[PDB]
Amino acid sequence: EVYNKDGNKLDLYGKVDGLHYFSDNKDVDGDQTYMRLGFKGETQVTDQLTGYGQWEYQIQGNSAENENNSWTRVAFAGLKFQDVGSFDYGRNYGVVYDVTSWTDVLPEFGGDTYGSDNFMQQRGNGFATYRNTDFFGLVDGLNFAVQYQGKNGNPSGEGFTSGVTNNGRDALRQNGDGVGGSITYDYEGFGIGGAISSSKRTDAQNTAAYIGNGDRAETYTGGLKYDANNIYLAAQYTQTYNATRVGSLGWANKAQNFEAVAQYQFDFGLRPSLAYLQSKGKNLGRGYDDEDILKYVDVGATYYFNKNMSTYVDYKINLLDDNQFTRDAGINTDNIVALGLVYQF
Amino acid sequence: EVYNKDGNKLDLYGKVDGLHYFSDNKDVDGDQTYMRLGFKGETQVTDQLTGYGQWEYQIQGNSAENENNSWTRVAFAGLKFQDVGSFDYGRNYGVVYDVTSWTDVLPEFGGDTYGSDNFMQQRGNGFATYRNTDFFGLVDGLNFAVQYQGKNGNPSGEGFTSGVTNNGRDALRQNGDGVGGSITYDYEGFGIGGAISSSKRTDAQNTAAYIGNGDRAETYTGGLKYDANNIYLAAQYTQTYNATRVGSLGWANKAQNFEAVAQYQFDFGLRPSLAYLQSKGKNLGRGYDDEDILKYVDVGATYYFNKNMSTYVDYKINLLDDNQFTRDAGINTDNIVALGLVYQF
Amino acid sequence: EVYNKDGNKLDLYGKVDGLHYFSDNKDVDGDQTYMRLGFKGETQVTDQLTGYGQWEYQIQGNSAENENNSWTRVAFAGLKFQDVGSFDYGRNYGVVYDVTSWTDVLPEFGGDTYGSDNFMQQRGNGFATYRNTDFFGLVDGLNFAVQYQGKNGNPSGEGFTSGVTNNGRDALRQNGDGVGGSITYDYEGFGIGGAISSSKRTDAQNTAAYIGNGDRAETYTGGLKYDANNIYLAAQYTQTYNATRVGSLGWANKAQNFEAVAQYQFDFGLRPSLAYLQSKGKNLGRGYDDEDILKYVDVGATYYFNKNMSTYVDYKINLLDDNQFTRDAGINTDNIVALGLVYQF
Amino acid sequence: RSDPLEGFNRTMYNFNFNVLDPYIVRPVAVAWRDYVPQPARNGLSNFTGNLEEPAVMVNYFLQGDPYQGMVHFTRFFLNTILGMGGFIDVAGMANPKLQRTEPHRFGSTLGHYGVGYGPYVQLPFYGSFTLRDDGGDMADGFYPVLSWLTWPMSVGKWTLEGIETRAQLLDSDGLLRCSSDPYIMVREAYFQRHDFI
Ligand SMILES: CCCCCCCCCCCCCC(=O)O[C@H](CCCCCCCCCCC)CC(=O)O[C@@H]1[C@@H](NC(=O)C[C@@H](CCCCCCCCCCC)OC(=O)CCCCCCCCCCC)[C@H](OC[C@H]2O[C@H](OP(=O)(O)O)[C@H](NC(=O)C[C@H](O)CCCCCCCCCCC)[C@@H](OC(=O)C[C@H](O)CCCCCCCCCCC)[C@@H]2O)O[C@H](CO[C@]2(C(=O)O)C[C@@H](O[C@]3(C(=O)O)C[C@@H](O)[C@@H](O)[C@@H]([C@H](O)CO)O3)[C@@H](O)[C@@H]([C@H](O)CO)O2)[C@H]1OP(=O)(O)O
Ligand SMILES: CCCCCCCCCCCCCC(=O)O[C@H](CCCCCCCCCCC)CC(=O)O[C@@H]1[C@@H](NC(=O)C[C@@H](CCCCCCCCCCC)OC(=O)CCCCCCCCCCC)[C@H](OC[C@H]2O[C@H](OP(=O)(O)O)[C@H](NC(=O)C[C@H](O)CCCCCCCCCCC)[C@@H](OC(=O)C[C@H](O)CCCCCCCCCCC)[C@@H]2O)O[C@H](CO[C@]2(C(=O)O)C[C@@H](O[C@]3(C(=O)O)C[C@@H](O)[C@@H](O)[C@@H]([C@H](O)CO)O3)[C@@H](O)[C@@H]([C@H](O)CO)O2)[C@H]1OP(=O)(O)O
Ligand SMILES: CCCCCCCCCCCCCC(=O)O[C@H](CCCCCCCCCCC)CC(=O)O[C@@H]1[C@@H](NC(=O)C[C@@H](CCCCCCCCCCC)OC(=O)CCCCCCCCCCC)[C@H](OC[C@H]2O[C@H](OP(=O)(O)O)[C@H](NC(=O)C[C@H](O)CCCCCCCCCCC)[C@@H](OC(=O)C[C@H](O)CCCCCCCCCCC)[C@@H]2O)O[C@H](CO[C@]2(C(=O)O)C[C@@H](O[C@]3(C(=O)O)C[C@@H](O)[C@@H](O)[C@@H]([C@H](O)CO)O3)[C@@H](O)[C@@H]([C@H](O)CO)O2)[C@H]1OP(=O)(O)O
């Protein structure tokens, strides 16, 4: 908080993380430090209408001084009314990520099932999110929201024709026009959430160079949560059809992923964590059958010195094989252990 | 303003807006969400000397996570005395931009007759501006400025045997050593000003068939403005020789840009707008005799909430016709409707 | 500075510099304005253990709109105890720079004998530096530190299967696992320090395309300082083996760097400067035998208007000659005039 | 005390101060003080003084003055870059102790060790002239920033200082008129104004 004027409350935040990787695989070995910066403002227009905006930038310091690797995580703005809902437009998280974030509580790992700009699963460009609080002021804990996704095609710089958009990207991040919604109910201590999304698939993702062909990408996502007496227990299980990114090969026809976490909070600051993730496929093509995209167990602990500096240790025990499918898709197999500290201001 | 001590005051500023383009042209439609970030700090050395600086950074939030589309707009520093004028060196707008800004009142569109880093028309590098206010404290409203231009040319690291510069770029924004000046007059609502620009052209701009070839690129800019009784009326007619950028073909030998605006802010907050733009090319090369470069009429309105939050709708009616000249240059000839939500802090 | 509550404090800092170079080399001539921005946070965990953070970003303002040139200079975080030392991990300065910083008070042209990520001579990645103040509170002025550097090799994912890391770069700045430490002693005004470094060399730097082949790269540096009676005199001698970079053709097998500085502080703000930099390469494996690399004399002065705004003037006297070795190495051998105007907020 | 050539070179001084002065210099001084705006006069005075700024440092270095020599070093640098070549007195306003002082030409350096003024000779259309101070003033023409000056425009630069000096002295023009012997009064004032500085 650096500004507390009349309806100009600006909260500047950010963090810097210095992390190192110790794995047998040379693809991810070495330093893994990064940095995040952003702000979160809020404007009180009146007693009912209230404007707000959020922004976050990530700058990676792993590269040298001759190159830069930076990207925008979330960038959106909108208005928030009173006891009737709120609407905002820009780069924000999807409705599915609202429920999946309960399980994704690991310090460094976690959330590897989905990828960036992977339909309505993580942060993306052109999201029209409508959020309502307390069900228009009727019940407590019952929150529901809807979202919309724009159509993104090939970049206009190169000649590709067909679907062309100004914010062009690679064929692994293109998406069409879809509509999704979510509804969560939160009681005291416990909590149950669920989301359903369906995004259109562009014509450039149905070629013969990428696995997975279809017209729609409707997904069903569940989840449970429990946060009471310093005990954090959450479980979730999604069912995505032609929406799970295997890697460089393309998208799996049908992949079922189940995640569960178990964390405890101590008085001195230690926060042990334990998670299990599986991404075994069902109807993989190109001769594959019942292949596992990702399967690992994360065990570690987090020590909180204060509200600004935190230390954690994470050990990723990979439980997947090293067959031809793993090498073709470029999936890591060696175990990764990372320890470091992050300072937040 | 987040810091103010011992004379030095820092005033952080910026804006975040989510934009989306709806048009029949596939090269411009899609998400265009960007943001601006910077600070405006100043310090007082003594009672007769004041220092100041300005920085700005534009980051496009519509790009994916594997690429970055961020760039700087203005970055300059200087010192200002009590009343002798003002001098600053760095990245800043040209003297002509101080006059053409009267018609640059549209929220998003407008000002398409010129381009960035195009001689003394927009923000560039190596700009030394000496601006005097109130004519050394003699007559109120009479101001003039003297500017200088560097010798930026071909890139140094591209292995060019001709004149090269460290901050090189493509053969579309290079310019020679030029000196220009402008004079502006103010009154009770009514305003009248003029600008004069003349910059040399590098030898790299006359190698290929760039259509516009000449030793010097003169530019005469004139116009008037009227801001009184919540009524905003202005006009501007410029005659630029080898200064306006046609597109991917080169430069126009003679262009007659004309643009006028008409706004009237209501007491509620609505500010309807109605502007028309025209750009007739003369003495064109490559067989073209007389073809229009830019001709459209823009209509829209904005509604500020309290001081910063505003919602605006734009509708550009392109009156240009598609032909061989427009297809080669790459100029859209179809109507485009845009919607945005700008949040300023 | 901008936020101080609940024991957490922030110190926003940075500068905006508008640079202009006057030289006939055309490789550095032109406007080279840049920008510096960063923060320095600090938290109070308890009465004995404290925390701090430092980050800095450099953005070049001389680029155009279609290109971006920026990099992260320093980014690290860690804790700080009361009287046993402080430990921090991330991007920071090496132990060799702690002795060479006494002669690096030059305004613009200083510390040109080394480079970033060059055998632990400047800012690098994966720097875990532990520093003790006042020798655990025993004596005054005896400061020593020890740090370790990780192994960085070829970039990952581009035709590389050996020496692969996630933070790879070009072979001109690769480094191995090296350990080094420095010890300083400042009793009253006068000071004497030294640093011993030994960094391993990767297999990519031992090829025939670059000069200098060895298992370990040793580096011994010594220096002296004196800051009293409003005068500043310092001198340092550096002896590096396969550590100093010489152009893009590799590294010198044996170099004897010697840098000295001389500055004076006046009551009205003028700070004259004078430096003599000498570096003679020895045992070159390309027929160049004993030559002179990067030899120049720097003379100039700096005027300080206040504690937040200052200006400086520099004049480099290049005594080196233009020969065959200079042509294929890319070494400036002519006088360069540089002027700027910094503004620290 | 006494100076040679007292009877001679005296009638021309009266003519230049009672015929040429009230008919050519005085009429143009009134118009210059009124018609020319005050900011214009200040800018011209600062620009003229900045041209001789890199010459005072050389004079101070010969006699020895590290404190005073560096004072004028930053005055020219700030006025050339941040003052449009001397139009704005950046260094003077930046520090109350860095204001512009009297010009110390080569005559002051020669007088530091002690040099007699010699005979007194009055030059036409110029006023008082001395072999030590005014005679030695033609020594900075070889130094940089001053050798580039051409002969035609150099004459007009001196005339600019005379108009500015005469305009400021219009308020005290009655002191010389009421003096019984203006030649004696103007001789002592010239020697005291220059002295050894
Ligand atoms: C609070 C918000 C929260 C959410 C709100 C509630 C949630 C529900 C809302 C969503 C549900 C809608 C139903 C649906 O979503 O439907 C289904 C899903 C069904 C499930 C239903 C569940 C519902 C859940 C409800 C929950 C309740 C609890 C899937 C689908 O999405 O259907 C798909 C269709 N899209 C829609 O239906 C969305 C839908 C949207 C329509 C847009 C309306 C205008 C926007 C309003 C702005 C709002 C203001 C804030 O429309 C409509 O329903 C009309 C209704 C509008 C309502 C939605 C608007 C949302 C905005 C919200 C903002 C508040 C789509 O069709 C065509 C679309 O093309 C246009 O682009 P272009 O014209 O090309 O530029 C426009 N594209 C857009 O993106 C619009 C825009 O970007 C996004 C919209 C806005 C979003 C951001 C705005 C927010 C910003 C605010 C910031 C503050 C769009 O409209 C247009 O025109 C629009 C027109 O321009 C411009 C309009 C003017 C603007 C005026 C504004 C100013 C007002 C003035 C005020 C003063 C138009 O629809 O494509 C395929 C069809 O396949 C084809 C085809 O045949 O076209 C086949 C193929 O064709 C061939 C051929 O045959 O030639 C075949 C081949 O042989 C071959 O040759 C190829 C050849 O190679 C190339 O040709 O071509 C090929 O061409 C392909 C693609 O083109 C290229 O691959 O498409 C369909 O798949 P399918 O149906 O499943 O099969
Ligand atoms: C408070 C702070 C105080 C201040 C800070 C510190 C101050 C002191 C500095 C440290 C002492 C210096 C000693 C030294 O510096 O030592 C010498 C110098 C001699 C003395 C000089 C003076 C010293 C005293 C000075 C006094 C001053 C006062 C030189 C050298 O450096 O020796 C070198 C060796 N040692 C070290 O590097 C340091 C060192 C290695 C460190 C290992 C310890 C583990 C880390 C501890 C974690 C920290 C705790 C927080 O030493 C060790 O052992 C253990 C000793 C422990 C010390 C390190 C602790 C650092 C922590 C800092 C503080 C936190 C090194 O051995 C092997 C290493 O390989 C692994 O990678 P891989 O996994 O295999 O990929 C791991 N690599 C690493 O980097 C580890 C990591 O990145 C660094 C860690 C620290 C950095 C960050 C810390 C901070 C983090 C953030 C904190 C917030 C590493 O561990 C491993 O196993 C795995 C891993 O760690 C263990 C897993 C993790 C376990 C713990 C984590 C969990 C914690 C639990 C918490 C609850 C393992 O040891 O390699 C070469 C050999 O050459 C080869 C080779 O054989 O490898 C030959 C060649 O091979 C061939 C082959 O085999 O055929 C031949 C070819 O023709 C061809 O065929 C190919 C074939 O195609 C493929 O093979 O390959 C080729 O491959 C080449 C390179 O590829 C190319 O150049 O390398 C040696 O050179 P040489 O001896 O000179 O010849
Ligand atoms: C707020 C202030 C605003 C302004 C204030 C009032 C407004 C008036 C002032 C501006 C207008 C000037 C008039 C004009 O604008 O003039 C005309 C216009 C006509 C009249 C209009 C008047 C309007 C008036 C309006 C009034 C309004 C009130 C056009 C033109 O611009 O003339 C042009 C010339 N003049 C200028 O550019 C500016 C200018 C010349 C510059 C004068 C010296 C610089 C002063 C330093 C600044 C001080 C800092 C404050 O003007 C001058 O005279 C003197 C004036 C001084 C002004 C500059 C300073 C401004 C800063 C002010 C800040 C306080 C220029 O000549 C040559 C120049 O080359 C050098 O580079 P080099 O390194 O040597 O290569 C230097 N280059 C520079 O840029 C200097 C520098 O970057 C700019 C400085 C300012 C910028 C930043 C300042 C602020 C910084 C930050 C501050 C915090 C420069 O100095 C030199 O020597 C060396 C150097 O400076 C000196 C070293 C530095 C010393 C001082 C530093 C230390 C001081 C402190 C110590 C205590 C030198 O003059 O080039 C072409 C000629 O064409 C050729 C040629 O023949 O050379 C043809 C061609 O040749 C051939 C050949 O050889 O045969 C033919 C071919 O077939 C082929 O074979 C090629 C072959 O392939 C390759 O060779 O070669 C080719 O080579 C080409 C190019 O090289 C390559 O394409 O050039 C002319 O075009 P043309 O006349 O139209 O034809």
Residue numbers in the entry:
A (entry chain C), B (entry chain B), C (entry chain A): 23 to 367
D (entry chain D): 11 to 207
Please give sentences taken from the publication describing this entry:
The outer membrane (OM) of Gram-negative bacteria is an asymmetric lipid bilayer with outer leaflet lipopolysaccharides and inner leaflet phospholipids (PLs). To maintain this barrier, the OmpC-Mla system removes mislocalized PLs from the OM outer leaflet, and transports them to the inner membrane (IM); in the first step, the OmpC-MlaA complex transfers PLs to the periplasmic chaperone MlaC, but mechanistic details are lacking. The OM lipoprotein MlaA interacts with trimeric porins OmpC and OmpF, where OmpC appears to play a more critical role in Mla function. Moreover, MlaA itself forms a hydrophilic channel in the OM; it comprises a ‘donut’-shaped architecture (constituted largely by five horizontal helices) and a vertical ‘ridge’ (formed by a ‘helix-turn-helix’ motif) defining the central channel.
